[PDB]
Structure formats: C-alpha cells, structure tokens
Write a protein that binds this ligand. Structure first.
Ligand SMILES: NC(=O)c1ccc[n+]([C@@H]2O[C@H](COP(=O)([O-])OP(=O)(O)OC[C@H]3O[C@@H](n4cnc5c(N)ncnc54)[C@H](OP(=O)(O)O)[C@@H]3O)[C@@H](O)[C@H]2O)c1
Ligand SMILES: Cc1cc2nc3c(=O)[nH]c(=O)nc-3n(C[C@H](O)[C@H](O)[C@H](O)COP(=O)(O)O)c2cc1C
Length: 205
C-alpha cells in the first residue's frame, strides 16, 4: 500500500512551496492547511484540497489530517526569531488529529542544530531551536512512525535529487537546497528505513 494522500503543513513557506509542487507533480493527492490562500501560487502544480485555517486550531488541523495516508510538516516562523511555541503546539494538534484519524506516518522538519553540539546554536536562533526541540519531543513520543528531518542551512540551489543523507549531522556540507529538502521529505514517504531516526540531508552544489 503506497502513500497516495498526504497533508502538508507549512506548504506556503520556502521549503513548503517546492515540496507541494513536487508532491503534486509526483502524483500525490495533496491537502494543505494555509492561513492565507493568496500565498499559494497560481502557476505550476496545484494541491487537490485547500483548507483555510490555523495549525493552532485543533479543528482546522483535524479537517486537514482526516483521510490522509501521511503528513509532512514544514512549519516555521519565517523571519520571526522570538520565543515561540507555534511549531510544537501545531505538532501537538497534528499528532492528536493523526491518532483520531488512523494516520500513522509523519515526516517533520526541525534543524541540524538538534544533531550538532547543542551549545553551538547562534544566540539569535536559540528560541526557535528550543521550540524545534519541543516539537521533536512531541513527535518522537507520539509513538507514530516519525521521520525527523534535521537540515542545515536551506538554500535556493536547484533540485538535484543527489544529496547525501546521514544519521548524525555530519555530511558533505552544511547546506541543502530547499528543493532537495522537499524531495527528501517525499522520499521518506516510500521507505520505512528512516522511521524512528534523525536524518541530515546535505550536498555540495
Ligand atoms: N532557513 C534555514 O536555513 C533553516 C535551516 C534548518 C532548519 N530550518 C527550519 O526548517 C523549517 C522549514 O523552514 P522554511 O524556511 O521552509 O519555513 P518558512 O519559510 O518559515 O515557512 C513556515 C511555514 O509555516 C506556516 N505557518 C506558520 N505559522 C503557522 C500557523 N499558525 N498555522 C499554519 N501554518 C503556519 C507558514 O505559513 P504562512 O505562509 O501563512 O506564513 C509557512 O507555510 C522551519 O522550522 C525552520 O526553522 C530553517
Ligand atoms: C542547522 C541550521 C539551522 C538553521 N535554522 C535557521 C532558522 O530556523 N531560521 C533562520 O532564519 N535561519 C536559520 N539558519 C541559517 C539562516 O537561514 C541564515 O542566517 C539565512 O541565510 C539568513 O537570511 P536572511 O537574512 O535573508 O533571513 C540555520 C542554519 C543551520 C546550519
């Protein structure tokens, strides 16, 4: 039984937009939860289903997760570095909705800071990193099949599909293109080999 139907959270963000386009082009039936639909593009591949709402609202999340085979999480805070619980509270709602609807696979992006020396996080990113840690804890303790994607700097290099995935935060570089990161999140839908693991995609462009 391959995954066919997925929900993407954070589909309008930098990585979300290209993950969404790639998923639709690849044949998935994609549902997105967006606060503002004007942030979805008109050109290119289009999601099958658009739910307007907020990941902080359980009912909105429930509507989005119902019926899916898997969930991709690309939530983030754009340029806001303030203390925050948006991602972890969103993940709480996602896990509850997954359990309410029988969905058992989640692929979620946090950051390579969760693999690197936890005393080398740049001060201005510490608050966001603390919420990534809370989000990781929520997902790992959910018991669901969870692939933790922990990328380094997200760049705008082209899609290659040729990046390296390690399990410990060491790799050929400290950059992954947004397009390659999205491609990897989709890869995680068709294998179990990363379930229960932390993954570090990187590439020399
Ligand atoms: N930038 C880097 O180099 C880097 C490196 C490693 C890890 N990361 C982490 O990687 C993840 C993905 O980063 P990104 O740059 O692709 O993300 P991003 O551009 O920050 O996009 C965040 C996404 O989350 C959505 N979102 C935020 N609050 C929400 C809410 N309350 N309800 C529903 N959706 C909400 C945003 O929606 P709107 O469009 O409505 O704002 C947007 O779709 C983030 O957690 C980031 O911290 C970033
Ligand atoms: C593991 C890792 C995680 C990162 N996480 C973030 C993050 O959540 N948010 C961010 O703004 N930058 C993060 N960065 C680096 C930023 O993307 C980088 O400072 C960015 O180029 C700043 O661009 P701007 O000034 O246009 O916002 C991360 C880098 C690495 C290696």
């Amino acid at each position: 039984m391959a995954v066919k139907k997925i929900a993407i959270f954070g589909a309008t963000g930098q990585t979300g937009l290209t993950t969404l386009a790639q998923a639709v082009q690849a044949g998935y039936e994609v549902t997105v939860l967006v606060r503002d639909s004007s942030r979805l593009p008109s050109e290119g591949p289009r999601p099958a289903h658009v739910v307007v709402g907020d990941v902080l609202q359980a009912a909105d999340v429930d509507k989005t997760v119902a019926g899916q085979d898997a969930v991709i999480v690309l939530l983030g805070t754009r340029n806001d570095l303030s203390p925050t619980t948006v991602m972890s509270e969103g993940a709480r709602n996602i896990v509850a909705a997954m359990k309410a609807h029988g969905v058992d696979k989640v692929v979620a992006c946090t950051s390579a800071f969760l693999l690197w020396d936890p005393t080398k996080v740049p001060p201005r990113l510490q608050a966001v990193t603390d919420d990534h840690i809370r989000m990781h804890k929520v997902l790992r303790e959910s018991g669901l099949k969870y692939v933790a994607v922990m990328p380094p700097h997200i760049g705008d290099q082209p899609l290659t599909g040729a990046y390296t995935v390690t399990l410990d935060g060491r790799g050929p570089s400290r950059v992954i293109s947004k397009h390659d990161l999205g491609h990897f999140m989709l890869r995680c839908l068709t294998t179990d080999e990363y379930d229960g693991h932390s993954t570090y995609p990187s590439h020399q462009y």
